[PDB]
Amino acid sequence: TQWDDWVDKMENLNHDILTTLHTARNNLEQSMITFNT
């Protein structure tokens, strides 16, 4: 249904954003460590 499909998209987006934020923080941490090398 229309509603189920929205739920599925929202939940997939949840996962995408979680992984994206983790990646961002990891890249930031890498740059900080390298700068202080």
């Binding site: 929202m10 994206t20 961002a24 890249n27």
Partner: protein, 57 residues
């Protein structure tokens, strides 16, 4: 010039990781915006249902 080459490599790495953080953050914003679009549609649909219920009541 091993050390200077190394420190230059470090400078490049920091710069490139900055580009990546920026790309990640723009991408995250776009994903959040897609979620906003979905919530918005759900909200409009629910409003429609509610309007009919109010008419029926």
């Amino acid at each position: 010039s091993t050390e200077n080459l190394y420190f230059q490599s470090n400078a490049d790495s920091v710069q490139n990781h900055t580009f990546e953080v920026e790309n990640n953050t723009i991408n995250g914003l776009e994903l959040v915006e897609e979620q906003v679009h979905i919530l918005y549609a759900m909200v409009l649909q629910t409003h429609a249902d509610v309007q009919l219920l109010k008419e029926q009541q």
